[PDB]
Design a protein around this ligand. Structure first.
Ligand SMILES: CCC(CC)CN(C[C@@H](O)[C@H](Cc1ccccc1)NC(=O)O[C@H]1CO[C@H]2OCC[C@H]21)S(=O)(=O)c1ccc(CO)cc1
Lengths: 99, 99
């Protein structure tokens, strides 16, 4: 579909047994999700934006369904105020910017 | 244009006769530029990002040409990690997300 930007580009995503609302975010290199206890190996990382940094856990090869489109890749999990679908997964679902 | 997302969507903007590089950021409500001088009245404001809150100077009705498309709107100046074009101006230049 086409998503205008009059409002936040929030869409429904699924990660296992959790449905969440997440921003389609061209400003984010990688996907960052709100705190959740995912299975598997991870590694610590610090990511920065307006206000400074937060600490996150990097999980790899996590499948996420984004508006019914399948994706699989890196997911950073930590105390973000909003779920953020970053470019690493936006490319996988065929997302472009157009004007 | 159509802009894919395998690389950061960085574009050249013209503001006050200066060329700068800025990131098209659909996860940003607001346009935020790194410290610079702009003429006219401004208002102190605060905004929050992934890492907390910062103080910015709010300038209204600033022209920016974004990849050759004209916008006139609110520009916040302050300690963002990188110049970002947010939805307030993305809407003005007709930017949508498509997948
Ligand atoms: C470095 C470029 C961006 C910061 C400038 C990166 N951010 C994505 C950005 O879209 C966030 C996404 C975002 C959205 C809401 C809350 C926190 C973070 N938006 C944001 O800070 O927008 C601010 C300007 O407009 C306001 O309206 C929304 C908050 C204000 S980020 O969230 O900090 C971020 C995301 C992922 C990574 C890992 O690659 C690193 C940083």
């Amino acid at each position: 579909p086409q998503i205008t930007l009059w409002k936040r580009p929030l869409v429904t995503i699924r990660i296992g047994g959790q449905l969440k609302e997440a921003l389609l975010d061209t400003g984010a290199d990688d996907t960052v999700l709100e705190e959740m206890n995912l299975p598997g190996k991870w590694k610590p990382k610090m990511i920065g934006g307006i206000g400074g940094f937060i600490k996150v856990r990097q999980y790899d090869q996590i499948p996420i369904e984004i508006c019914g489109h399948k994706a699989i890749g890196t997911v950073l999990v930590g105390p973000t105020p909003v779920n953020i679908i970053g470019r690493n997964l936006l490319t996988q679902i065929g997302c472009t910017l157009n004007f």
